[PDB]
Amino acid sequence: MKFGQQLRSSIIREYQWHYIDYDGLKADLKRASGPLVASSPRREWTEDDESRFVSKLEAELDKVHAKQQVKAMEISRRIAVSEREVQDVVGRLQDSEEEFMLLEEDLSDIIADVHDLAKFVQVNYTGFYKIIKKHDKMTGWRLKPVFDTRLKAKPFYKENYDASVVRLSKLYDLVRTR
Numbered sequence: 001m002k003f004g005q006q007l008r009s010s011i012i013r014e015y016q017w018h019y020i021d022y023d024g025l026k027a028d029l030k031r032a033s034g035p036l037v038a039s040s041p042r043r044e045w046t047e048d049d050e051s052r053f054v055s056k057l058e059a060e061l062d063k064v065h066a067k068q069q070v071k072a073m074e075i076s077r078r079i080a081v082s083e084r085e086v087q088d089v090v091g092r093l094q095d096s097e098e099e100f101m102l103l104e105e106d107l108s109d110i111i112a113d114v115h116d117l118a119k120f121v122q123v124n125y126t127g128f129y130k131i132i133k134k135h136d137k138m139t140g141w142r143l144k145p146v147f148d149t150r151l152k153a154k155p156f157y158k159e160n161y162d163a164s165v166v167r168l169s170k171l172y173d174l175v176r177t178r
């Protein structure tokens with residue numbers, strides 16, 4: 001594989017300082033402080049090395065989850081203000097081609113922002129998934145049993161955000177047709 005270069009190439013300036021420190025966590029796995037193990041020598045992985053890695057991994061997990069929250073909530077706010085704008089536009093034109101034009105460009109920008117956030121969620125989820133399996137393969141100590149459900153854990157906004165994205169798709173189809 002070539003994730004180290006893949007993640008670096010797929011960096012958006014909007015999320016630039018909030019991506020996984022994949023190279024940083026990979027370097028931490030090589031920094032073992034236990035007894036020297038012979039192989040036809042490299043130091044062994046300890047409880048202290050494990051505690052250091054988990055703390056560094058959790059700090060990276062919070063950094064990603066914080067950026068995922070701020071952007072999704074801003075998108076949910078952007079959907080809410082645009083939904084009202086479409087509602088009074090469809091309402092007034094029931095009781096102008098330019099009005100649909102401005103709304104079509106505004107709603108499509110949110111769809112692109114949803115995809116760019118989905119790309120960030122994708123590249124980061126793969127990042128943690130790959131580094132956790134790398135830890136289990138290099139050290140021998142398994143981190144996957146509790147970290148698989150920690151990454152699959154759904155935040156508070158996720159249920160309301162997914163419904164907003166569903167409405168956004170319906171709002172865009174309504175302005176494009178009329």
Ligand SMILES: O=P(O)(O)O[C@H]1[C@H](OP(=O)(O)O)[C@@H](OP(=O)(O)O)[C@H](OP(=O)(O)O)[C@@H](OP(=O)(O)O)[C@H]1OP(=O)(O)O
Pocket residue numbers: 001002003004005006026130134
């Ligand atoms: O191809 P790169 O992006 O330059 O990075 C590779 C690649 O790492 P990632 O795919 O996880 O980013 C190898 O991983 P695999 O091909 O095994 O999936 C990994 O190999 P090992 O895990 O077996 O070590 C190797 O590591 P390294 O050379 O540090 O031992 C590492 O290379 P670099 O870290 O030197 O870029």
